[PDB]
A paper describes a structure:
The enzyme that resulted from DNA shuffling, which was denoted as PvGmGSTUG in accordance with the nomenclature proposed by Edwards et al. (2000), clustered together with the tau class GSTs. PvGmGSTUG was crystallized with two molecules in the crystallographic asymmetric unit that followed the typical dimer formation found in other GSTs. Residues 1–5 in both chains, and the fragments 214–224 (chain B), and 216–224 (chain A) were not included in the structure owing to high disorder. The analysis revealed that each monomer of PvGmGSTUG consists of two distinct domains: at the N-terminal region a small α/β thioredoxin-like domain with βαβαββα folding topology is formed. At the C-terminal region a large helical domain is formed. In PvGmGSTUG, a Phe residue replaces Lys, a change that could affect the orientation of GSH. In PvGmGSTUG, it is replaced by a Cys residue, a change that could make the H-site more open and possibly alter its binding properties. A fourth hydrophobic residue, Leu134, is replaced by Ala134 in PvGmGSTUG, a change that may contribute to weakening of the interface. Structural examination revealed that the key residue bridging the dimer interface, Asp105, may play an important role in inter-subunit communication. This residue could interact with Lys102 from the second subunit, forming a strong salt bridge.
GSTs are multifunctional enzymes that have evolved from a thioredoxin-like ancestor gene. GSTs catalyze the nucleophilic attack of reduced GSH (γ-Glu–Cys–Gly) on the electrophilic center of these compounds, leading to the formation of GSH conjugates that display higher solubility and reduced toxicity. Each subunit displays two ligand-binding sites: a G-site and an H-site. In the present work, DNA shuffling was employed for the design and creation of a library of tau class GSTs (GSTUs) from abiotic stress-treated Phaseolus vulgaris and Glycine max.
Author numbering:
A (entry chain B): 6 to 213
B (entry chain A): 6 to 215
Write the structure that this text describes.
Amino acid sequence: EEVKVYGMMASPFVSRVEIALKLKGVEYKYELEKFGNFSDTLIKYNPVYKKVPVFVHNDRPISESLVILEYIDETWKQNPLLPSDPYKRALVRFWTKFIDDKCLSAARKATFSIDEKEREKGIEETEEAFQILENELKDKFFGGDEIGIVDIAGIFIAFWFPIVQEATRLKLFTSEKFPKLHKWSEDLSNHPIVKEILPPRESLLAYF
Amino acid sequence: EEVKVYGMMASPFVSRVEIALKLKGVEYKYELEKFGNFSDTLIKYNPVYKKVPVFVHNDRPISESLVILEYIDETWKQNPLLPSDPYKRALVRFWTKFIDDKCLSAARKATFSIDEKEREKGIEETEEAFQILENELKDKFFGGDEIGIVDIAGIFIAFWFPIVQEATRLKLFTSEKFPKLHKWSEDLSNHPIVKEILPPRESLLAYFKA
């Protein structure tokens, strides 16, 4: 009967839950939370981290985002996210690990300045440590022809990353340096439902 | 026929695979690795992370350690390691995730010095944020009646951490502070399996004091 999400206006983690949940064809109340100090009924549901996205249904919570994704894929078996073969499903998880390791690309092209920035290099390796292994324009994108988990796990690349370099004024991400997955970023655009769960394009530019 | 693990002589992660791999009643050839710079036929199997344990069988590698445990459960299903219900299957993975999310806590107050030591205090919260929520002297240890996945993910507590403090001369870990899980630490001693892939304790004690 009941299915309840806890999250903010623009967390890429709260996004990765909603998309997965929305492809499933599942309804969901959405209750917002404060950027700073949160509510109590959520901190009761994640007293450990006190972090969104927290996902509950019939009052039973599931904290942390990458574990939520793997819950919903084997509860509603409409539009599978994860591969069906135990080995390629094992490979697929190895990449969501890597996408989570890669996220440290955001923590260096966003929240730094001056010299403490260019004590960096990793992002350029990851994008190559990407493309050159995954293949998302020789055939479709990641997990089969439609949206897989690795796609959703990397939406802070497909959408949020293009919109952040306008805090470093950087042009790392372009069809001259990383062509194979710049056209993959199109993941942002398509899907007449994913097509919102993502906020407006120009509004976010203001925030950075 | 063939099944291969690649790793070092006493990595807590390489232990974490082998026990899991052992419970199922599965053989495994074992190839050792260089403390410093590694071989090529391993980095051909793990060009991305370049850290053991790398696990292969029928030439098909699986790098990264917590995913290997979940691989062995799904083709070799005798005494299942993961829960059957999608919720507790989510929690048990939610718990491996926390144990591994914390892990820089164990490596904080152990192999560091001066200020960066007592700049930790997370260990004492997590160790309480362990037993104050686990409550597994109520029944067995973690996941069900036999060894469950959450246990193996936290073997760097059950074995290494007890050893590892007598380099900073710390006494954080005692049965007086964490009784539900100090008595759990005897997961190592009990159980005819965790026993043997775990090296000697007194040999290991020598390594850290150096």
